[PDB]
Amino acid sequence: MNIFEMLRIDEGLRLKIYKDTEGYYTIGIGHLLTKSPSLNAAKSELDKAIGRNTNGVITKDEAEKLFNQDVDAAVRGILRNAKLKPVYDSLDAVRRAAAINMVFQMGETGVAGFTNSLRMLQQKRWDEAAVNLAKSRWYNQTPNRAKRVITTFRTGTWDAYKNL
Ligand SMILES: Fc1cc(F)c(F)c(F)c1F
Ligand SMILES: [Cl-]
16 A cells, blocks of 8 residues: 555546536546636646646546646645644654645645644644544545545554555
8 A cells, every 4th residue: 555546545536527525627536627617617727737638538647647746746735834844754654645645635725724633643642633633624524535544644554445
């Protein structure tokens, strides 16, 4: 298991434009295209992302290309953020994956309200951190995925992704 396999489980793979859990146009392995309700706006973003006139469908290779870029972008986002970097630096590699997972799903602005969770994670108060993380819109809207991510933070193991 690793961040790539982990996110592949959580996001799936779809080669045609679809709507994510929030109703937003998305493609590939959870690549958000736009928050606009316009499908044309979404296709435009797709073309711009891929570098060709696609009209809504990409190849697996193209999906994986965007996926690698997105994982990269999440890591870079964490490292450039003064609040996130120290917590991330403090974690072992498994829990780092859990962190990247969160940022991939909700962005830096989504993780902004997680100050107290972040403090607990840096203190390595795993059970307390896990409880705090579940007290969120994130957990309530996507409980099964949040549960997996939280278990990863709680245990520092890949147990929640085994048999998946
Ligand atoms: F973005 C992040 C989200 C988390 F839940 C973290 F623990 C973290 F270190 C981090 F950088
Ligand atoms: Cl389409």
